Amino acid sequence: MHGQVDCSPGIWQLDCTHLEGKVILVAVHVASGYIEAEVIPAETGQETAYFLLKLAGRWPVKTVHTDNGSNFTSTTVKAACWWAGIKQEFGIPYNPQSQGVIESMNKELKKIIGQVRDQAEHLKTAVQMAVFIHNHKRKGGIGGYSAGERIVDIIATDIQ
Amino acid sequence: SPGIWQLDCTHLEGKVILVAVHVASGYIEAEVIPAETGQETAYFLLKLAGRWPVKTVHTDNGSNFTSTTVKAACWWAGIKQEFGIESMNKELKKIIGQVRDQAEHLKTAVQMAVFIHNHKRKGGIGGYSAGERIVDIIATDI
Amino acid sequence: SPGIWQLDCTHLEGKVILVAVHVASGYIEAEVIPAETGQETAYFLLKLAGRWPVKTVHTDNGSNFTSTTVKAACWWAGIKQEFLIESMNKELKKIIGQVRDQAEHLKTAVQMAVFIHNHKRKGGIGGYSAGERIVDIIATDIQ
C-alpha cells in the first residue's frame, strides 16, 4: 500500500486482474505504492507492450517483474522492454504476508472499485476512480504523504 | 550444476505423475499425484529439498508450477525458480510399462519404475547407475 | 554399514509419522501416512529404496512392519528385514514444534523439520550436516 522501504526506485510489478468479465492490467511502483491501471481489449502481449511503453516514457523504469502468462512472455513485450531499456524478470517476488505486492494491490483495487462502483456507469470510469483514490490517499506512514507524492519525490531525489 | 533440477507432469492411465530429474546425473524421483495442483507439487518439492541440495528448479508455465503454493515453498526452501527431461518422461513411461503388470495400482508401479531406472546398471559395469552418479556428484561438490 | 536403516512409527496430533533413519549418517526421512498399516509402510519403503541403496532395515514387530505387503516389498527391493531412531523421533518432534505455526497441516510441518535436521551443521566438532554425511559415506562406499 505505502511501498517497501528497502526497494530501489526502478522496480515495478505488473499483473492482470479480472472484473465483470473484463481485463485490468495493473503496474505498481514497489517502493512507493503508486499504481497505474487500465482495462484492455484482450489479455495479449500486444496489449501488455503498449502499456509498458506508456509507463517507460514517463517513469524511469529499470526492472519489471511479472508472472509467466503468454501475454507477459511474448516477443512483443520482450522487444518492447529491450527498446525501453527495461530488464524483465519473470516471477513476482513472494512475500509471506501480502503474497505479492502487485497482488495485494489488485485486491485493494477491487475493494475500492467495489465501493465507488455505484458512482460510475462504466467499469473503465471506476477503475480510474479507484486508482485516483488509492494514489491520493495519505497516512501516518510519512508526514501525510500519499503514494502519488512519494514516487515523484523518490524519482526527484534520484534525478537530483 | 549439481543444484539444478527439472520438474514436469505427465499422464498415463487417466492419471497424473509428478517427475523430478537431476540434470547432471539423470537421477529421477517421481510420484502419482491425486491432482495437478500447486499444493501437491509444493509438498513433493519440499520432500526433495530436505533430502538433496536443491538450488534451482526448471519447469514449464503449468498452473501447478506457477502456483503460489509452489512459490511459497521455494522461498521457504531457498529455491530459485526458472521457466522455459522430455526424454526422461519418455524413458520413465517405458520402464513403467515393463513392470506395470507386477502391480495393480499405478502408484506402486511408478515407484518400482523409479527404483529400476535409478539402480539399473549402465555401461556393463557397476558404479554408473543414475543413483550412483548423483551421490558422487553431490559428495564431490560438498 | 552404509546400507542400514532404522524405521519406526511415531504419533503427533493424532496422526501417524513414519520415520526412517540412515544409522551411519543420522540423516532421516519422515512422512505422515493415512493409516499405520503395511500397505503404507510398503509404499514408503519402495520410494526410499529407489533413491538410496538400502540393504537392511531395522524395525520392531509392529503389525505394519511384519505384514506380507511389507515383506514382498523388501523381497522385490532386495532388502533384508531385521526385527537411534527412537531418539531421532524425539529430536524430530522438537523441531516440528519450532516450526509448527509456520504451516497449516502437520504434513508440511514434518517436511520442514526434516529439511532443517538434514541441512543443519552440528555435532562432531561442528562441521558437516546429516544431509552431507550420508552422501559422503555412500559415495565413499561406491568409490
UniProtKB/Swiss-Prot annotation, chain A:
Binding site for Mg(2+) 3: 15, 67, 103
Cystine bridges: none
Compartment(s) of residence: Virion; Host nucleus; Host cytoplasm
Location of the Integrase catalytic domain: 5-155
Record's subunit section: Homotetramer; may further associate as a homohexadecamer. Part of the pre-integration complex (PIC) which is composed of viral genome, matrix protein, Vpr and integrase. Interacts with human SMARCB1/INI1 and human PSIP1/LEDGF isoform 1. Interacts with human KPNA3; this interaction might play a role in nuclear import of the pre-integration complex. Interacts with human NUP153; this interaction might play a role in nuclear import of the pre-integration complex.
Domain writeup: The core domain contains the D-x(n)-D-x(35)-E motif, named for the phylogenetically conserved glutamic acid and aspartic acid residues and the invariant 35 amino acid spacing between the second and third acidic residues. Each acidic residue of the D,D(35)E motif is independently essential for the 3'-processing and strand transfer activities of purified integrase protein.
Role: Catalyzes viral DNA integration into the host chromosome, by performing a series of DNA cutting and joining reactions. This enzyme activity takes place after virion entry into a cell and reverse transcription of the RNA genome in dsDNA. The first step in the integration process is 3' processing. This step requires a complex comprising the viral genome, matrix protein, Vpr and integrase. This complex is called the pre-integration complex (PIC). The integrase protein removes 2 nucleotides from each 3' end of the viral DNA, leaving recessed CA OH's at the 3' ends.
Protein name in UniProt: Integrase
Organism: Human immunodeficiency virus type 1 group M subtype B (isolate NY5) (HIV-1)
Residues of the whole record sequence present: 1197 to 1356 of 1435
Swiss-Prot record, chain B:
Subcellular compartments: Virion; Host nucleus; Host cytoplasm
Binding site for Mg(2+) 3: 8, 60, 86
Superkingdom, taxonomy of origin: Viruses
Integrase catalytic domain sequence ranges: 1-138
Comment block on domains: The core domain contains the D-x(n)-D-x(35)-E motif, named for the phylogenetically conserved glutamic acid and aspartic acid residues and the invariant 35 amino acid spacing between the second and third acidic residues. Each acidic residue of the D,D(35)E motif is independently essential for the 3'-processing and strand transfer activities of purified integrase protein.
UniProt subunit comment: Homotetramer; may further associate as a homohexadecamer. Part of the pre-integration complex (PIC) which is composed of viral genome, matrix protein, Vpr and integrase. Interacts with human SMARCB1/INI1 and human PSIP1/LEDGF isoform 1. Interacts with human KPNA3; this interaction might play a role in nuclear import of the pre-integration complex. Interacts with human NUP153; this interaction might play a role in nuclear import of the pre-integration complex.
Function in brief: Catalyzes viral DNA integration into the host chromosome, by performing a series of DNA cutting and joining reactions. This enzyme activity takes place after virion entry into a cell and reverse transcription of the RNA genome in dsDNA. The first step in the integration process is 3' processing. This step requires a complex comprising the viral genome, matrix protein, Vpr and integrase. This complex is called the pre-integration complex (PIC). The integrase protein removes 2 nucleotides from each 3' end of the viral DNA, leaving recessed CA OH's at the 3' ends.
Protein name, as recorded: Integrase
Species per Swiss-Prot/TrEMBL record: Human immunodeficiency virus type 1 group M subtype B (isolate NY5)
